[PDB]
Amino acid sequence: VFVLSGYEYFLGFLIICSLVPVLALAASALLRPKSGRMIRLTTYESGMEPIGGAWIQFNVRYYMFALVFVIFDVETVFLYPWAVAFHQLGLLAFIEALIFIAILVVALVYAWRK
Amino acid sequence: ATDFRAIMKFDGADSPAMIAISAVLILGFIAGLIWWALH
Amino acid sequence: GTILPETILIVTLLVVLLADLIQGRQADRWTPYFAIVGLGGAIATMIPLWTQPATISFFGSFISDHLSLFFRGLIALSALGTILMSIRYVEQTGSSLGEFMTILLTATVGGMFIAGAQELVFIFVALETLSIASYLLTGYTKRDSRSNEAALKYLLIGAASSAIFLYGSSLLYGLSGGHTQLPAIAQALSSESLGLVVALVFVIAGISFKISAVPFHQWTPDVYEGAPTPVVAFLSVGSKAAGFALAIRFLTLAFPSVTDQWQLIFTVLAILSMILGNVVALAQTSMKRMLAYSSIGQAGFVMIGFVVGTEAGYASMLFYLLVYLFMNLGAFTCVILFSLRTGTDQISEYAGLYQKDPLLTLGLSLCLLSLGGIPPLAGFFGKIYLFWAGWQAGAYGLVLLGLLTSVISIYYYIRVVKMMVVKEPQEMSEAVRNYPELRPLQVGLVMTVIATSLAGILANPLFNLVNTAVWDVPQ
Amino acid sequence: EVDYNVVDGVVNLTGFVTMVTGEGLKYLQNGRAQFYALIVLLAVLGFVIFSV
Amino acid sequence: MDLATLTQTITFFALAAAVIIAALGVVLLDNVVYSAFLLGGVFLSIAGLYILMNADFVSAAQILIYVGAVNVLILFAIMLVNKRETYTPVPGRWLRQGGAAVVSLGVFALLTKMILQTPWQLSSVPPTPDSITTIGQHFFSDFLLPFELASVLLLMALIGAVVLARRE
Amino acid sequence: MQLTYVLILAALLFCIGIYGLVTSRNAVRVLMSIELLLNAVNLNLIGFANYLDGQQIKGQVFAVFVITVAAAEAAVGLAIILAIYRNRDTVDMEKFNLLK
């Protein structure tokens, strides 16, 4: 049983699109110089050589945004069928969903004030 | 024990062996009498 | 439809938002008050819908019979006491207050939902609200390594146990066709089977993590040491009450009231819990660790409470749990009030306190003694009513064993009184030499100690309560 | 001496036994989440073996 | 005995092999970055398995949340805590594994013994395609409390993580 | 394509997740296994929904709530792990043994 009708192109196209990179890239090794491996493998630090140690001094400046993104991105999945069923539902489900959205906005304001 | 130091100065009474063969007699005495009593 | 059973919950929910908004605008407000006000208003809203109307269901996803009223009011009182404790305890540490009470009220709303639920999805979501809030509050003071370690370990363990519960719930949806309800689930499958037993056991694993039963206990000791203390005070009482309400309302009603092997499993867990907590707390030096293993043993007493379902074992659980609320909150108020002033340390530093602060001594002594089953005191009546019920049905080994483990637990409950009373001024510790000698805490301690010292003889008014509550569960 | 040793020691031994039991059972609690991961789900699955 | 049911079968077994291999890669590989990317692969393969089972919304949501957001969060948190993975072995490093293995294996067999013993109710009716309007109806007819309450769940989780990872 | 092997595949993910849950050395590598367990349960639910209860899908909604809560809980877990990395400066989970 398969009622989705609209697939059997997704599969083959996932195949052909997973096959364009591997094939345009395999049509490069057949015609290209080989490796040149001594000093062309070094790492680009603007002409000079890297200093050493090579750490990053990690920060939450990019973690916290992923955190709040996970929150507000889980949230949207609760809204697509709401919008799509808003024809059938009508009232008392808009009143009941603006609660969801208002508590979301409270979370947004919390993250905003910090 | 070491607290019982008076005219009660019997030496061979605190050893574990003598305590054992004293408790044997006392327990066997009460046991012979409880068997005598039931029957 | 029928939001009237829901009012209490959403009422508390309202103030959650409020206690963030005033905390987002002012950053220093009087939020400790009127949270008490809304919790009192909730417990007041419980009376009009206690017995005046009949039991009703929201949509079938939520039922509000007297049992749910009991557990909801209980968890609300636990949150109230924990707030009254934690106001000037969390302020002593360099941390906020608004997010704290927000999370505490959120856990409270979750546990007040889960006591009246009969549907799988909603059970899981409420359980996860309470669990995640606990995961946070365990690590809210991240300046210490042990707090964060406990929060990590508690989070990971609880996530795994919840996933097991969730697998079992998936199976129970699977079996009997669709049915995500609970009265309809134990309605289309009504016979012993392998998969039903697997689902049973996984749900037992999910619940025992909440009610601290052994071998599902290893989180309680480490977490109760590491975590903030008033967090633990809410955690034990509220998480247990939610767990036991879940146990009844799942195993009895939604799950099955046929495959009654779970009684045997709870006998095993209660036996092990009594034998473990009361024995291993006897070898400790910290209070919070001792209280953890105590809580395990008290859970074992409760578990023999409701393993004998005859309309009195369940009632005995309910009463003893109401009573353990007061008792344990009083003990935690006393250890808070000691750890604030100068001490901030373990059992051996309580010595010689009867000269400095006699009020705290009265409080903690009465609470600890009630936990061990001492006469006139409420815990004694709770334990003897447990024994009455569990003996009436025919469990003979459990009664003797629980009695014996209470006789064992009195030892480590009396060590603290040996310290606080017997130890003379020639044996004070360094902490008590320089002891000096807040308001909401004192009034809470009084309101708690008078209860645990008077709510044992004044018992008929709240045995009628519980026996009115427990007409509803099948048996 | 039979009273102070053969009678008293036998019952004080009860306290000794239920003390050393507590001293030696806490090692079950070892401070390892993986040991709980073992004796949580292997703590059960014995409860299924004598069930069905 | 058909071409349309054959593609479903071949795709299903391919996706299942990918899932198993990538999960074993998550769990066995010493390096953890490879494990994170293979975890993303597991998520994609499971989202492709759901489509065979007439669930498209939840499939797109798994591709949108887990691999999209959570996996990125893990790929941040992992370089937050990389220090050349200098771990010295313990003597019982094998022992624990063995225990886990047999325990885990038993569970599988036990679960398998259920899955092949119980008479499932196959319910021969064609499923419904509109698996998104129906979920909208269920969020406001049956499962409304979880909607309204997961709201405050997400609020509380934000409030928690924001004040547990904050640098101070 | 049958319900039986779907259930078996989910149980195999469950087994593997337990193996990674007990075998783990790191602390971020445990949430990965937990997420695998949650995926397995979702898979069981979707199978039940397709075969057993189709005309009103009811397990798909429950899987939506599952992926929701799992995302939130993973968020909170990584937040805790970021904090323990501040103090102990590692994630070797066998160094978090504060009991003997």
- Would you say F91 and E74 are in contact if contact means Cβ atoms under 8 Å apart? no
Any idea what DSSP says for residue F96?
Answer: -
CB atoms within 10 A of CB E119: 6
Per-residue tokens: E21: 């291999």
Domain boundaries, chain E: 3-162
CA distance A28 to D21: 73
CA distance F72 to A77: 14
Q: Is E103 on the interface with C (CB under 8 A)?
A: no
Chains contacting C (3 or more CB pairs within 8 Å): A, D, E, F
**Identity of the residue numbered C71:** F
Give the list of residues 6+ apart from residue D39 with CB closer than 8 angstroms, or none: C215, C218
Q: Tell me which method was used to determine the 3D structure.
A: cryo-EM
Q: How far is CA C448 from CA C161, C173, C367, E112, in A?
A: 34, 43, 9, 52
Q: What residues of B are in contact with residue D5 (Cβ under 8 Å)?
A: 16, 19
Domain boundaries, chain A: 1-114
Query: Can you say how many angstroms the Cα of residue A90 is from the centroid of all Cα atoms in its chain?
Result: 33
Domain F1-100 belongs in CATH node 1.10.3720.10: no
Residue with token string 């808070």: C336
| Count of structural domains within chain D | 1
- Please list the residues that pair with C117 across neighbouring strands: C62
The burial class, CB within 10 Å (0-12 / 13-18 / 19+), for C152 is buried
Fold annotation for A1-114: Methane Monooxygenase Hydroxylase; Chain G, domain 1 (1.20.58)
Phi, psi of C117, deg, nearest 5: -100, 150
Measured in residues, chain C has a length of 475
Per-residue tokens: C259: 């495959």
CA distance F97 to A38: 48
Q: Is E70 on the interface with A (CB under 8 A)?
A: yes
**Identity of the residue numbered A93:** A
Alpha-carbon gap: F47 to the closest alpha carbon of chain C (Å): 9
Q: Which CATH class is domain E3-162?
A: mainly alpha
**DSSP string for E89-130:** --TTHHHHHHHHHHHHHHHHHHHHHHHTTS------S---S-
Per-residue tokens: C340: 């604030």
Phi, psi of C62, deg, nearest 5: -165, 120
The burial class, CB within 10 Å (0-12 / 13-18 / 19+), for E83 is exposed
- Would you say A103 and A78 are in contact if contact means Cβ atoms under 8 Å apart? no
Give the residue numbers spanning the domain of D11: 1-52
CA distance C46 to A25: 70
Over the Cα atoms of chain C, what is R_g?
A: 21
Q: Decide: F and B in contact? Rule: 3+ Cβ pairs under 8 Å.
A: no
Cα within 13 Å of Cα(B32), Cβ side? 6
Q: Is A15 on the interface with E (CB under 8 A)?
A: no
Q: How far is CA F77 from CA A88, C152, F82, in A?
A: 39, 7, 9
**Identity of the residue numbered C312:** A
Asked if the bond preceding C215 is cis, omega within 30° of 0, the reply is: yes
Q: What residues of C are in contact with residue E160 (Cβ under 8 Å)?
A: 99, 103, 132-133, 135-136
Per-residue tokens: D48: 């299924």
* Nearest residue on chain F to C168, alpha-carbon basis: F41
Q: Do A4 and E4 touch (CB under 8 A)?
A: no
**Identity of the residue numbered C238:** G
Domain boundaries, chain C: 1-475
Nearest C-alpha neighbor of C103 from the set C157, C140, C53: C140
Resolution value in angstroms: 3.3
- In chain D, where do the E strands start and end? none
> CA quadruple A13, A17, A22, A26: dihedral positive or negative?
positive
Angle between helix axes C313-341 and C378-393 (nearest 10 degrees) is 150
Give the list of residues 6+ apart from residue C295 with CB closer than 8 angstroms, or none: C212, C220, C224, C236, C240, C277, C328
